RNA sequence: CGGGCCCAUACCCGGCCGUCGCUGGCAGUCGGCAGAGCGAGAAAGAGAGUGGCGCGGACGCUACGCCGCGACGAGUAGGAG
RNA sequence: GGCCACGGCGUCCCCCGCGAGCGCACGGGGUCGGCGGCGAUGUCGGCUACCCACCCGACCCGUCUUGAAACACGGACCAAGG
RNA sequence: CCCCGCCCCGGCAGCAGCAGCUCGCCGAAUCCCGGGGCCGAGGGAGCGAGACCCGUGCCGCCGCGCUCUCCCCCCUGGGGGG
């Protein structure tokens, strides 16, 4: 029977079913963004302390 | 305790009004039985705004619910007792219907046999 | 073997923090490598009989429905993840909006296992007893009570509060209410005018617009 | 006996499972390789422009070889020649999209169809969103949604493109089998442009929507998806 | 012991200049005069209350003359504070310019 | 000249009706005399041999029948079913 | 310091074919193993059919004609024949 | 106020800036969270033993966690972790 199409841009497991590398790509993106945010906030804190 | 069918889906009808013949309200010689307008200048035929609608094929009902009575069964006309063993094995999907010509003494027997066989009758207390 | 908590912390829903071989190393799979009724005899008083624990049906209907295609994500109501609004914390003052107690300011205590809020209300203040309410049909005002130093009896739950079947108030309900209300009253007597605020009733008057007023 | 027949069947199933795992690893590594290749492509042009600016000269990038074309006007009142070229471009309905590779012949055809289309140079993100969100295949002359990699493999494996990742790779960096990939792709059925159009009847340069947006077609795609 | 429902006026139906779509209703809530100000009322359920000749049953009371058609505020309309409402039965055309009760309890505050 | 907003039977998603195409699928309901399959990227065997207790298993197929995939739907004079 | 579709022995030539279990789910189209009320002479249900009101739309059919609502012709109404 | 040359483009913040608006184009150089509305089409997809078996109704692809190795930590045999 006809299958229901699901949007891979919004559906993580469908995106993985069509491209398994998306998982590691997204994990790297999330980790890098978290690290960058932490660096930015600590740099701002150090700058305001040094003010 | 009326008998229930096997399944009772939600019957959806794309239209409940009837398609009346054009301009039948203005005349008595014209019945409401639908006739397709064929005039060269007929606005109903040309499908102008705000006019009488025509019976397209897109109005056809669902095949799963087509001919289903509001009770959930489908009618079958029966004239005597021997035509109820026909519905014996279509018990939960099909009901019986006694003809207008059957007399009271035979309607009683048909109703009794149908009650025995658990076949639903849509006009069980017609004449008495 | 003794079970262990999952070694893969979640980053977001569905994505673990560590990679596949990182988990391989953490689980240490390198050193864990591995390699390759129906009838009961019941005695009878000539010989013995064999009894069938399952007997074939004695009546078959005229017709039967086919089976259903089976899906995956559908769960019973008992195990849905239950959420609460951030503006609602134990001790906040709510406004009932639906029932016979509509418009009465009350006190929030806890959220039950069915997702229904457990509201107390002081009987001496606004005649609202230990009651369940729905999270949606309330308004969370910005007024809190330091309720953390209050103990709610464990035995009171959804099974307790559910309707049974003229209604009579049981002594168990009365004593539970007495305990909880005696525990809660002094803590709200410490806030000036709060008892009067709880005793009053919320209503809308001329020119008063709900979307303009901070609740 | 059946004792060894059962084990033969189980061995066959195990072989299928191992082959499937091998294919999964292959497509995963291919996706990673394509990611690195895209990153190199994107940094190389910037580096060349920077070195040209340092040297004081100018670096003219290679003119784009891929285009995305959208039919803007409707079906009523069309010249026969415009109609024929639209039919050849596979835009038989309003708001259909189609990738086109750009050469002299295609550019002249687009110049003919200039009043009836809006087109430009799509981004890698544009290609990805179009392929995943609204990507359908032409399998046994049927419009079939690409809900798994086997549909692409069975119809394009002969060209050594196995997954939607290297399908997107071919479409973006047009290769030896871009013609076959595009013909496999059914014309994209985009929606109405959310946020409104400027003017359907006029060229982009005069503030309308016809003509060739260079890289505003990416904004148009974002709105039409 | 007071009003717990906001005041709204059934302005008219969803329409163009020459076509009317009866399944959607347009409402003026008082005090809201901006699209960015209508956000509070999205999803709130609304009711139309009227009287008839003979009695009908009421939840938690003896039958009386009152009848109600229920609805729900779907999304905003225009820039001046209109909203769109969808009722389980299309509002009668005699209710143009009459009071529609807009409730508060489907709340997300 | 700029944001926002309103709506056609147009476009997108979904349901239902019919037509067209796949000149698609189903005789495999082969059950204790039995062993459940033909959907999956890449031709062709669930091939045969020769030497080194408890008695059980839904519906179906008026084959002019039933079922599944996609696309399509204006219409006078006129033609056909 | 951080990351990974890295994970055994055996030699020969190059440079340098079947592990067992469990369980969770963004996974080939919705379920609740969730609830609340009201019902005997006045109430419940009846998308259709009878009357009325309101909003929007809406010129009288057939016919010749490039062009018909036409200040173009045929037509009071009904039944039977055609 | 605007200009020249030297001082490491004089140095220090930061950086298409939450001094939420002085001026762009973006996302393989992109991810997370939340709210409103509409919809629920289909109905025997099998799983495991197997001539030693006649169970079962969670099944396929896809993404995972735990045990068949052994230690240690926290909060109360249970859960959370290294
Ligand atoms: Mg004409
Ligand atoms: Mg035109
Ligand atoms: Mg808009
Ligand atoms: Mg009153
Ligand atoms: Mg559609
Ligand atoms: Mg059409
Ligand atoms: Mg036609
Ligand atoms: Mg009018
Ligand atoms: Mg008129
Ligand atoms: Mg004439
Ligand atoms: Mg003339
Ligand atoms: Mg005329
Ligand atoms: Mg005139
Ligand atoms: Mg005359
Ligand atoms: Mg004449
Ligand atoms: Mg006359
Ligand atoms: Mg006659």
Curated annotation (Swiss-Prot), chain B:
This is Large ribosomal subunit protein eL32. GO terms for molecular function: structural constituent of ribosome. It comes from the Eukaryota. The keyword Phosphoprotein applies. InterPro entries: Ribosomal_eL32, Ribosomal_eL32_CS, Ribosomal_eL32_sf. Belongs to the eukaryotic ribosomal protein eL32 family. There is a cross-link at residue 8 (Glycyl lysine isopeptide (Lys-Gly) (interchain with G-Cter in SUMO2)). Signal peptide: none annotated. It is found in: Cytoplasm. Transmembrane segments: none annotated. The modification N6-succinyllysine is found at residue 49. The modification Phosphoserine is found at residue 61. One of its GO terms (cellular component) is cytosolic large ribosomal subunit. Coiled coil: none annotated. Component of the large ribosomal subunit. The ribosome is a large ribonucleoprotein complex responsible for the synthesis of proteins in the cell. GO terms for biological process: translation. Component of the large ribosomal subunit. Keywords: Cytoplasm, Isopeptide bond, Phosphoprotein, Ribonucleoprotein, Ribosomal protein, Ubl conjugation. SUPFAM superfamilies: Ribosomal protein L32e.
UniProtKB/Swiss-Prot annotation, chain C:
GO terms for cellular component: cytosolic large ribosomal subunit; rough endoplasmic reticulum. The keyword Electron transport does not apply. It is found in: Cytoplasm, Cytosol; Cytoplasm; Rough endoplasmic reticulum. This is Large ribosomal subunit protein eL6. SUPFAM superfamilies: Translation proteins SH3-like domain. The keyword Transmembrane helix does not apply. The modification N6-acetyllysine is found at residue 166. Keywords: Acetylation, Cytoplasm, Endoplasmic reticulum, Isopeptide bond, Phosphoprotein, Ribonucleoprotein, Ribosomal protein, Ubl conjugation. Component of the large ribosomal subunit. May bind IPO9 with low affinity. Gene3D superfamilies: 2.30.30.30. Belongs to the eukaryotic ribosomal protein eL6 family. The lineage of its organism: Eukaryota, Metazoa, Chordata, Craniata, Vertebrata. The modification N6-succinyllysine is found at residues 42, 151. The modification Phosphoserine is found at residue 71. GO terms for molecular function: RNA binding; structural constituent of ribosome. Component of the large ribosomal subunit. The ribosome is a large ribonucleoprotein complex responsible for the synthesis of proteins in the cell. GO terms for biological process: cytoplasmic translation; ribosomal large subunit assembly. Its main location: cytoplasm. It comes from Oryctolagus cuniculus.
Swiss-Prot record, chain D:
It is found in: Cytoplasm. One of its GO terms (molecular function) is RNA binding. Keywords: Acetylation, Cytoplasm, Phosphoprotein, Repeat, Ribonucleoprotein, Ribosomal protein, RNA-binding. It holds the Pfam family Ribosomal_L30_N. Coiled coil: none annotated. The modification N6-succinyllysine is found at residue 104. One of its GO terms (biological process) is maturation of LSU-rRNA from tricistronic rRNA transcript (SSU-rRNA, 5.8S rRNA, LSU-rRNA). GO terms for cellular component: cytosolic large ribosomal subunit. Component of the large ribosomal subunit. Homodimer. Interacts with DHX33. Component of the large ribosomal subunit. The ribosome is a large ribonucleoprotein complex responsible for the synthesis of proteins in the cell. Binds to G-rich structures in 28S rRNA and in mRNAs. Plays a regulatory role in the translation apparatus; inhibits cell-free translation of mRNAs. NCBIfam families: uL30_euk. This is Large ribosomal subunit protein uL30. It comes from Oryctolagus cuniculus.
Swiss-Prot record, chain E:
Gene3D superfamilies: translation elongation factor selb, chain A, domain 4. It is found in: Cytoplasm. One of its GO terms (biological process) is translation. Disulfide bonds: none annotated. SUPFAM superfamilies: Translation proteins. The modification N6-acetyllysine is found at residues 7, 62. Keywords: Acetylation, Cytoplasm, Ribonucleoprotein, Ribosomal protein, RNA-binding, tRNA-binding. The modification N6-succinyllysine is found at residue 62. It comes from the Eukaryota. PROSITE patterns: RIBOSOMAL_L35AE. InterPro entries: Ribosomal_eL33, Ribosomal_eL33_CS, Ribosomal_eL33_sf, Transl_B-barrel_sf. GO terms for molecular function: structural constituent of ribosome; tRNA binding. GO terms for cellular component: cytosolic large ribosomal subunit; synapse. Pfam families: Ribosomal_L35Ae. Its main location: cytoplasm. Component of the large ribosomal subunit. The ribosome is a large ribonucleoprotein complex responsible for the synthesis of proteins in the cell. Required for the proliferation and viability of hematopoietic cells. Belongs to the eukaryotic ribosomal protein eL33 family. Component of the large ribosomal subunit. This is Large ribosomal subunit protein eL33. The lineage of its organism: Eukaryota, Metazoa, Chordata, Craniata, Vertebrata.
């Amino acid at each position: 029977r006809r299958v229901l199409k699901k949007n891979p841009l919004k559906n993580l497991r469908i995106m993985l079913k069509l491209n398994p590398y998306a998982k590691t790509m997204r994990r790297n993106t999330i980790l890098r963004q978290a690290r960058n945010h932490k660096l930015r906030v600590e740099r701002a804190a150090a700058a305001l302390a040094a003010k | 305790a009326a008998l229930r069918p096997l399944v009772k889906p939600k019957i959806v009808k794309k239209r409940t009004k009837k398609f009346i013949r054009h301009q039948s309200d203005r005349y008595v010689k014209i019945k409401r039985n639908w006739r397709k307008p064929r005039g060269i200048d007929n606005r109903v035929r040309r499908r102008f705004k705000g006019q009488i609608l025509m019976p397209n094929i897109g109005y056809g009902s669902n095949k799963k619910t087509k001919h289903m009575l509001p009770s959930g069964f489908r009618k079958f006309l029966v004239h005597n007792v021997k035509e109820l063993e026909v519905l014996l094995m279509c018990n939960k999907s099909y009901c019986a219907e006694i003809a207008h010509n059957v007399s009271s003494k035979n309607r009683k027997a048909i109703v009794e046999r149908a009650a025995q066989l658990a076949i639903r009758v849509t006009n069980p207390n017609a004449r008495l | 073997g003794k079970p262990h908590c999952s070694r893969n912390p979640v980053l977001v829903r569905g994505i673990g923090r560590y990679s596949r071989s990182a988990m391989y190393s953490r689980k240490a799979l390198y050193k864990r490598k591995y390699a390759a009724l129906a009838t009961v005899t019941k005695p009878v008083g000539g010989g013995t009989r064999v009894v069938k624990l399952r007997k074939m049906p004695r009546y078959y209907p005229t017709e039967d429905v086919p089976r259903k295609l089976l899906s995956h994500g559908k769960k019973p109501f008992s195990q849905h993840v239950r959420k609460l609004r951030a503006s609602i914390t134990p001790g906040t003052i709510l406004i009932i909006l639906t029932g016979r107690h509509r418009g009465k300011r009350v006190v929030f205590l806890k959220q039950l296992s069915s997702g229904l809020l457990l509201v107390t209300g002081p009987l001496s203040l606004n005649r609202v007893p230990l009651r369940r309410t729905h999270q949606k049909f309330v308004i969370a005002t910005s007024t809190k009570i330091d309720i953390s130093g209050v103990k709610i009896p464990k035995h009171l739950t959804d099974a307790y509060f559910k309707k049974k079947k003229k209604y009579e108030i049981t002594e168990q309900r009365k004593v539970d209410q007495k305990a909880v209300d005696s525990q809660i009253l002094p803590k709200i007597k410490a806030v000036p005018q709060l008892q009067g605020y709880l005793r009053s009733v919320f209503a809308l008057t001329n020119g008063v617009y709900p979307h303009k007023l901070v609740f | 006996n059946f004792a060894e027949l059962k084990i033969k069947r189980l061995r066959k199933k195990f072989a299928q499972k191992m082959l499937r795992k091998a294919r999964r690893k292959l497509i995963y590594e291919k996706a990673k390789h394509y990611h690195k290749e895209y990153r190199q492509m994107y940094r190389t042009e910037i580096r060349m422009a920077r070195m040209a600016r340092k040297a004081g000269n100018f670096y003219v990038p290679a003119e784009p070889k891929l285009a995305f074309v959208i039919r803007i006007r409707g079906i009523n009142g069309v010249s026969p020649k415009v109609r024929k070229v639209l039919q050849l471009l596979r835009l038989r309905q309003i708001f259909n999209g189609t990738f086109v590779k750009l050469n002299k012949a295609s550019i002249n055809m687009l110049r003919i169809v200039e009043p009836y289309i809006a087109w430009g140079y799509p981004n890698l993100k544009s290609v990805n969103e179009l392929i995943y969100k609204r990507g359908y295949g032409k399998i046994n002359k049927k419009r079939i949604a690409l809900t798994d990699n086997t549909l692409i493999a069975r119809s394009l494996g002969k060209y050594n493109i196995i997954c939607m990742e290297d399908l997107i790779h071919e479409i973006y960096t047009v290769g030896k089998h871009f013609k076959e990939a595009n013909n496999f792709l059914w014309p994209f059925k985009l929606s109405s442009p959310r946020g409104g159009m400027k003017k359907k009847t006029t060229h982009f340069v005069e503030g309308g929507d016809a003509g060739n947006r260079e890289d505003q077609i990416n904004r148009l795609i974002r709105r039409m998806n | 012991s007071g009003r717990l429902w906001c005041k709204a006026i059934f302005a008219g139906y969803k329409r163009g200049l020459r076509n009317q779509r009866e399944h959607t209703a347009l409402l003026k809530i008082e005090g809201v005069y901006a699209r960015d100000e209508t956000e509070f009322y999205l999803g709130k359920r609304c009711a139309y209350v009227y009287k008839a000749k003979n009695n009908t049953v009421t939840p938690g009371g003896k039958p009386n003359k009152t009848r109600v058609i229920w609805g729900k505020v779907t999304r905003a309309h225009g820039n001046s504070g209109m909203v769109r409402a969808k009722f389980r039965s299309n509002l009668p055309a005699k209710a143009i310019g009459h009071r529609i009760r807009v409730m508060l309890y489907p709340s997300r505050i």
